[PDB]
From Swiss-Prot, chain B:
The record marks R73 as: Transition state stabilizer. Homodimer or homotetramer. GO terms for molecular function: catalase activity; heme binding; metal ion binding. Binds 1 heme b (iron(II)-protoporphyrin IX) group per dimer. Belongs to the peroxidase family. Peroxidase/catalase subfamily. The keyword Oxidoreductase applies. This is Catalase-peroxidase. Gene3D superfamilies: 1.10.520.10, Peroxidase, domain 2. NCBIfam families: cat_per_HPI, PRK15061.1. Bifunctional enzyme with both catalase and broad-spectrum peroxidase activity. Its EC number is 1.11.1.21. It comes from Burkholderia pseudomallei (strain 1710b).
């Protein structure tokens, strides 16, 4: 009820997304290092306790079949299942299921119970196992307990301490069907990027069918699209759904109107739980979670091949659960499926609409039949897919901790070869920077190429960055933002330098192209500082390696293309989201604060890093010199700015007294003179005492970006 | 995009505790603004500001060729958002340059005033904060026009994001009272903590209450709002008449000409707003308030013409060119200069709220005294201007520069100078042992030191343990302080003090303020020992004891804790939920969410609750410093339900037997409910956390004890 700045100005940009996750909200000390904690955990001990928990039923949420394994597999699947390849946001890697909004999503109903069941284990091991690792490890132990051998497990997901700022959609009603005022669909059922779910508060798709219509073929279209938006192909998708639905059951014993407030809405006495139900005992046999009432197999607590036997072995009739939801029952079947609580009851086989998709979509049916005929193929596929699902956002294999990490390198990990030769030392770095500057490559070309290589990193899923030298490979070499023709010329010169240096060495010392691109960028920044009269050495850390084309999945790389990069004043097309919002989004992915974003952008503009050598925001008469000119000129009140008649998103800056044109700029350039918080930062850097501070802060942020993916040095 | 606040609009907001991280600050971690300021050539800055006064810019031409009135309004408004209820607002953080205050309707065209000052800010850089520059500029404006100010102190460090302040619940700018989110109830009772009559005003409406042009009624709103800003009748009259000696209002055409406020304006406006389509949009055509008044015959020179005109004319109700109600002198000649045309003159004019100074009977007495004795007027105005502009700066030890007034003012809650050697580490150890041998308990010691130190609030830097004001009126008799228990503790400590000071040589002595804090430190050490942990709690001497004569009792009243969740105390029944009031108190204390959480769970097991209430005392070893609050709060074997007698008190029963185990309030149980607070509770309730909990508790306790220690900056 107190009115806030977001109430008064709801379309203004939000910078607090860049300053979340401060050391203020973190209870652990500054020096806490979770990897080091984890590495001394007795992982086998934790696994024993998790095995014991499986069948330790608690009366406040009694275990179906006497075994929590299905509930825990669903919990871990949902932890990972929020992931979107568009921006890398979501996934299991930050344990965000325990914070709002995900703790209270309708699709996460009763997973508050699942997490609560794990607190005694959490408490016993304390800081040595994060919630984020614990949720995945529990799902793995559930599978092992029920007879499925997993492909492996890595720890190293540090806990976080507040909610992430993620765009989950614009709907203001949970579960709203398509076509409303804030619809996430347009056109021929085109889901808006970056979303990867069909309704607000769902993980991927609606189990009754698209917008509730129980058509398995149409549902399969939604399955395919959302799963692809979560990095899964058809084979992985079938394996995951059929694999998962080998276990456990759904819950829909009575009408959904019996279920009360989600956790964030519940009373303080609920002590963090939600969805309290007035139906009968509210739990156990009477539980209501989705509103469906399906049990897939004849042994829901044991790995089996019964899913596909049932799917293909019966014909299916449409029916309704006790809550009124659409679901399917096997025609003419006997009552062969066990009841979760009463040994004297058995049930006919049942399926969701979206399970039927696996049989009635023609591409899925071929895979399903293969898995039915070849169950060893199904098991192997499901094990690989479960590992990928649960590790997709963990980043390079260098982050993976503990004794159960799979040795097999997987293409989806964007793998980087091991380095098996001496690295360049400081004298060698100095020799190579001189050679780069004697080649004729310009500051603009050197800065632009390193920026292009390093700025693909995003902290949301720890993909991208300059390691691997993938800028030389498809598809990065051909991205428009990367200036393919310019890039090719710089890479040819750098590869000739490299060849010359490597051919002159002894021992096995060599420099990778990945390291040379970054070092060359560093030489450009040093040259730019010299051009401005400043003596600056830029730090450089060797050790990057070059990945091959065959180690580079081109379709998976596509999502890393910068379609909006304000740091290079680039926008690939016209978007509904304003460019300055896209700039803050990119800064968040790069892990930048607002001051770092500000310094970086103003430096890049005067170094010539704009795509196409655009003059928009180039507020200097000494381009390729590292100065604070961007800020001093942007803040000059002798210039008046107006949008152009040709293009409302480009602005002309004229002398206020004469009308003479002095500059042009975009929304990304001018926001720094408009937003009250951004302008306060620009004033610091545009003050007469600030040139050396600007240069030193620029070098620090430049080095930060160059090192974002260097978990080999963590 | 839909946010958590959208889905759950009533859920508690912890992000207010985590502002001002080193993430959002452009200056290095090691920047110290006092060190930069102390080397500023303040005289040179003032010479540049003096020259700016009469250097008109054509994008916002100077009225009368002089920006001094604009800048005095700018500085008044920077200071004028201050509220004594919570200390929030004021000029001390330079928040006029951030949302929402940069876009309040009462701050219209002060974007232009701040813009005029950027060349000077640019020249001097980090050596002068925006916060200090806005105030300095108002002083130089006054001095340039012939008024002697009382002084100036630097030291307001800049901030880098908006403050989270409750300004009201209205959703429309300037909404008149009586709407669905009215800030008035009863017989025109303004809701605490608010200190303005309408959302987006500084104090009152210049046309009269809700627009009704009755000076007598307006005076009641003036008196109420200004008292809520720490000003009495003399100060109020001096300030309004002082201010309105200078400059003019702006209302040349209809207000529908004036476009979006700065936070709403297009990107091309480059941080300015209120662009006007009326004629030239500026200068002679300017529209700010919509009133068109010029008070004196010399708007660029200090005078006593405000009161000569107020009392020398009778007044007629009239309307400005924008349609606002205002007053014009009956029968008068055209003696007031025009701001741009030297061939035009105007009749004297006044606002409804100016006329309050004559038609309220108490104001009229003061106004007539100042009219007859303009030297009294000048002195009252200079003192009130200093107070206004420094009220949120904190102890005088924060005051920087060569123009600091030597006079000590009662409103500063002054602390006497220390003129003797301080106790050393071995002395402190001796005194801690003497305190523990006296028979004072852990609960008594912790509760007394908490009581003394936790009056601090970082909003205006008032309060804290320095001064030993806990022994004086009114603190000694506040209910939350447990007056009879407190008196017993204080008598025991004063006997220890007397014994130790009587045994010394060389003039060494310990103040009661330091011994209160040290005794609390001994209690926390003892509690740790009771748990099996040997720890030393840090302690820094150098507090002094203030006298009763040096303590304004009425000004102290706003520091009374009516809600202190750290002592499970709520003085009465409020509309705002107790958990929200806990977060508000944590923000005032400058605590993060982790610090709040540790501190509360420790206080509960040390016996710090008012009245020895058992609510939240989730331990069987009270007075031992353990993490038992968290381990017991998180025990899923306990089921919690509100009591039938009181919905805000909960019983914790064994889930299997029904046996009563504990009771708690909303402040206790929020740590088990709120998803971010429960995550913190889980860290401190884990089996590996004993050592960490003790360490973190001692660190936040020491932070609280030192909040007012600017003598150690
Ligand atoms: C098209 C994709 C999917 C849909 C629409 C879907 C739908 C559902 C629904 C409606 C439930 C019932 C929740 C309740 O009422 O308790 C559920 C349960 C479950 N799902 Fe899925 N699912 C999908 C994919 C997955 C995947 C990929 C996994 C894991 C690999 C998985 C594993 C499980 C398990 C184990 C259960 C049983 C939970 C219990 O025993 O408590 N599902 N699924
Ligand atoms: C009851 C309290 C007060 C009310 C209702 C009030 C009202 C106003 C209004 C409506 C304006 C015209 C804004 C514009 O259209 O440009 C203004 C101007 C001004 N006020 Fe006040 N005021 C109050 C107190 C003060 C105080 C305490 C001071 C300072 C000590 C101050 C100093 C000024 C000055 C110098 C101007 C002239 C600005 C210029 O020349 O641009 N006022 N006042
Ligand atoms: N929403 N979460 C992210 O965007 C992110 C998380 C961690 N580092 C960079 C970005
Ligand atoms: Cl996320
Ligand atoms: Cl404030
Ligand atoms: Na992610
Ligand atoms: Na304040």
């Amino acid at each position: 009820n107190g009115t806030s700045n977001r109430d008064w100005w709801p379309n203004q940009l939000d910078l607090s997304i860049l300053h979340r996750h401060s050391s203020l909200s973190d209870p652990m000390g500054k020096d806490f290092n979770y990897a080091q904690a984890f590495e001394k955990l007795d992982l086998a001990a934790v696994k024993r306790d998790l095995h014991a928990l499986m069948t330790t039923s608690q009366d406040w949420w009694p275990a179906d079949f006497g075994h929590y394994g299905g509930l825990f597999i669903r919990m871990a699947w949902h932890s990972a299942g929020t992931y979107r390849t568009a921006d890398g946001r979501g996934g299991a890697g930050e344990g965000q299921q325990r914070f709002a909004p995900l703790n209270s999503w309708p699709d996460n109903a009763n997973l508050d119970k699942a997490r609560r069941l794990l607190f005694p284990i959490k408490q016993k091991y304390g800081r040595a196992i994060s919630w984020a690792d614990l949720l995945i490890l529990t799902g793995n132990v559930a599978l092992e307990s029920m007879g499925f051998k997993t492909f492996g497990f890595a720890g190293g997901r540090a806990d976080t301490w507040e909610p992430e700022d993620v765009y989950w959609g614009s709907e203001k009603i949970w579960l709203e069907l398509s076509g409303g005022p804030n619809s996430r669909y347009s056109g021929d059922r085109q889901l808006e990027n970056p979303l990867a779910a069909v309704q607000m508060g769902l993980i991927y798709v609606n189990p009754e069918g698209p917008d509730g219509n129980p058509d398995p073929v149409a549902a399969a279209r939604d399955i395919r699209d959302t799963f692809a938006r979560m990095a899964m192909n058809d084979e992985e998708t079938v394996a995951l759904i059929a694999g998962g639905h080998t276990f456990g059951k759904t819950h829909g014993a009575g009408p959904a109107s019996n279920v009360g407030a989600e956790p964030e809405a519940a009373g303080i006495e609920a002590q963090g739980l939600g969805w309290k139900s007035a139906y009968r005992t509210g739990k156990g046999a009477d539980a209501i979670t989705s509103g469906l009432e399906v049990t897939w197999t004849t042994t829901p607590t044991q790995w089996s091949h019964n899913f596909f036997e049932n799917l293909f072995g019966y014909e299916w009739e449409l029916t309704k659960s006790p809550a009124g939801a659409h679901q399917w029952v096997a025609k003419g079947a006997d009552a062969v499926i066990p009841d979760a609580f009463d040994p004297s009851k058995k049930h006919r086989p049942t399926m969701l609409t979206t399970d039927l998709s696996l049989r009635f979509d023609p591409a899925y049916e071929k895979i399903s039949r293969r898995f039915h005929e070849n169950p060893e193929q199904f098991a192997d596929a499901f094990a690989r897919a479960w590992f990928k699902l649960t590790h997709r956002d963990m980043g390079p294999r260098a982050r993976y901790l503990g004794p159960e990490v799979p040795a097999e390198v997987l293409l989806w990990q964007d793998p980087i070869p091991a380095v098996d030769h001496p690295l360049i030392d400081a004298a060698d770095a100095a020799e190579l920077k001189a050679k780069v500057l004697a080649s004729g490559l310009t500051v603009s070309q050197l800065v632009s190429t390193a920026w292009a290589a390093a700025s693909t990193f995003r902290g949301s899923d720890k993909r991208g960055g300059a390691n691997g030298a993938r800028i030389r490979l498809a598809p990065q070499k051909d991205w428009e933002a990367n200036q393919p023709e310019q890039l090719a010329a710089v890479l040819e010169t750098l590869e000739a330098i490299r060849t010359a240096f490597n051919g002159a060495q002894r021992g096995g010392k060599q420099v990778s192209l990945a390291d040379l691109i970054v070092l060359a960028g560093c030489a450009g920044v040093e040259q730019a500082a010299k051009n401005a009269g400043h003596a600056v050495t830029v730090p450089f850390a060797p050790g990057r390696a070059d990945a091959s084309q065959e180690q580079t999945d081109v379709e998976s790389m596509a999502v890393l293309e910068p379609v909006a990069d304000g740091f290079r004043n680039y926008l690939k097309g016209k978007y509904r989201v304003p460019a300055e919002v896209l700039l803050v989004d990119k800064a968040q992915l790069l892990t930048l604060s607002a001051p770092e974003m500000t310094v970086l952008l103003g430096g890049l503009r005067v170094l010539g890093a704009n795509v196409g050598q655009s003059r928009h925001g180039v507020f200097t008469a000494r381009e390729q010199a590292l100065t604070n000119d961007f800020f001093v000129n942007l803040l000059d009140m002798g210039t008046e700015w107006k949008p152009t008649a040709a293009d409302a998103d480009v602005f002309e800056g004229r002398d206020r007294a004469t009308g003479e044109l002095k500059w042009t700029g975009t929304r990304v350039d001018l926001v720094f003179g408009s937003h009250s918080q951004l302008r306060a930062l620009a004033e610091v850097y545009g003050s007469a005492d600030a040139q050396e501070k600007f240069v030193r802060d620029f070098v620090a942020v430049w080095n930060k970006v160059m090192n974002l993916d260097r978990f080999d040095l963590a």
